[PDB]
Copies of this chain bind each other. A is one copy, B any other.
Amino acid sequence: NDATRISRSDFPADFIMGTGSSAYQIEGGARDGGRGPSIWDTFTHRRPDMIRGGTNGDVAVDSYHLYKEDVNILKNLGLDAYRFSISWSRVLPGGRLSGGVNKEGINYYNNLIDGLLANGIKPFVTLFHWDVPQALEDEYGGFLSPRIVDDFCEYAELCFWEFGDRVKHWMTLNQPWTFSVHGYATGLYAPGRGRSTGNPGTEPYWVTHHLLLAHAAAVELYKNKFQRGQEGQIGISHATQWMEPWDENSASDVEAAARALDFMLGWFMEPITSGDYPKSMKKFVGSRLPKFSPEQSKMLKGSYDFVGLNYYTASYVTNASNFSYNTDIHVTYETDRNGVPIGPQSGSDWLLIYPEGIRKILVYTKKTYNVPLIYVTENGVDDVKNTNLTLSEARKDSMRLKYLQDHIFNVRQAMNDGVNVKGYFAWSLLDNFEWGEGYGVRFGIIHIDYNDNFARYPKDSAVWLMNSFHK
């Protein structure tokens, strides 16, 4: 009943604790070991103006060469599991089979997986984290085109065949919302489209449409071809953010909030639930929103063994007043009620600390979509920016410590409220590359010294997690 005392014994024996990362944010080795370029290589190299400080992830924090050390950090940490993604163009440098299979890349992921297991850490592997192979992008528009479904399936298949004997927990995509929206609506993330040159009214909906089909075809492939031999499970992971009615009463705000949810989580959750987009979306986007063949619907319906959700912050929503995903939602976001922000800021101004959000979003998801099995796949906060601190100052991440305590507590509540959560993954393991943000933002429970070969050192949060949750 007091969050600072929360610990492993407040959870069922089989509950899974872990941490995570994605390939491009940590691996480096961009051009080592036969890896091909991804759209994020091109984006950061051709448009350095789009990145704080003009940096990229050629080297990142060099987990590609330092992975034996990360594994050792994970062993000392004590948690059950580690979540990471595979770099598509490291194993298939030309994206599709005819561009060559990269043995060295396969060999890297085998080494990582063997190391995790030799140490009793269970791997959760995500197939895709926005790093589309540049060659598929240049050949046919990547996820714009539906050719991407077949290529994606060849890739998924390669992975199950090589790693499936050991990896028993797969996810097809992570955060597809973010890919679709900032890739094609705002143009702020690779491939940087839409303000032809792009179109925020249309492309985001095709891209999301192709994402979902790719997800579904891969899940079917796994279920029909691998599941019986390998006995693992497959799932997917979604961006979420709690939507709160600016005015508790105005049932017009209650609507705005519920619409904001549809356009973020329903956009992906409805189709794998009933095989169709949500009415709210069909209503306000109308004919710009693609439809599913009925065999497509039949294939998307129930396409998952579990769902993971990533949660960070929350917002107030109210109603609003050529075409564009953003304007299509017809909402405005507010941060305060009468001068009071929904929660304090972290180091980042888009991130307001609101622990109750995670309990809500979890309950809302079980209620609205009826998922039988959930993982919190990402959750965390960033240090305040300050290049002026020596290590012993830098590593005292009180705010992060409290932020994890509070959110893990709320996860525990949601379980009492009947939501079946099988685990929680803190984000992230290492300070790393943060996309448009470059290296200026630190999300890690492990500190990275950029001045001295990416030296790893544990923050207080890390030690707290090991002590409270070791096993």
Which residues of A pack against B, CB within 8 Å?
Answer: 7, 30-32, 34, 37, 45-46, 48-49, 53-56, 58-59, 75-76, 78, 93-94, 96-103, 134-135, 138-139, 150, 154, 157, 161-162, 164-165, 225-230, 387-392, 395, 451-453, 455, 457-458, 463-464, 466-468, 470
Contact = CB atoms under 8 A, between A and B. Distances in A.
Q: Which 7 A-B pairs have the closest CB atoms?
A: A54-B387, A138-B138, A229-B470, A58-B452, A229-B467, A97-B391, A98-B390
B150 A451 contact: no
Contact of A226 (B55, B100, B138, B467): B467
Number of copies: 3
Specify which of A49, A164, A451 lies most central, judged by the most chain B CB atoms within 10 Å of its CB: A451
27 contacts: A30-B100, A31-B93, A37-B135, A45-B98, A45-B390, A46-B98, A48-B389, A53-B387, A56-B451, A56-B452, A58-B100, A58-B452, A76-B165, A97-B390, A97-B392, A97-B395, A98-B390, A98-B392, A101-B455, A157-B463, A161-B458, A161-B466, A226-B463, A228-B467, A229-B468, A229-B470, A230-B470
A76 to B, nearest CB: 6
Nearest to A53: B387
A405 to B, nearest CB: 15
Contacts of A45: 94, 98-100, 390
Contact of A468 (B56, B78, B138, B228): B228
Given A45-B99, A58-B451, A98-B391, 10 more contacts: A30-B100, A31-B100, A54-B388, A56-B452, A58-B453, A76-B164, A96-B392, A97-B391, A138-B139, A228-B470
A54 to B, nearest CB: 3
B463 A48 contact: no
Given A100-B452, A138-B135, A161-B458, A225 B48 contact: no
A355 to B, nearest CB: 23
A139 to B, nearest CB: 7
Nearest to A231: B470
A138 B39 CA distance: 13
Contacts of A453: 58-59
Nearest to A450: B55
A227 B225 CA distance: 42
Contact of A390 (B7, B46, B58, B135): B46
A455 to B, nearest CB: 6
Nearest to A160: B463
B458 A225 contact: no
B228 A94 contact: no
Contact of A161 (B55, B96, B387, B463): B463
B157 A37 contact: no
A452 B457 CA distance: 23
A432 to B, nearest CB: 14
A59 B165 contact: no
Contact of A76 (B48, B161, B466): B161
A440 to B, nearest CB: 10
A193 to B, nearest CB: 15
Contacts of A458: 161
A48 B99 contact: no
Given A37-B99, A46-B98, A161-B458, A229 B391 contact: no
A34 B104 CA distance: 12
B451 A49 contact: no
B463 A75 contact: no
B229 A466 contact: yes
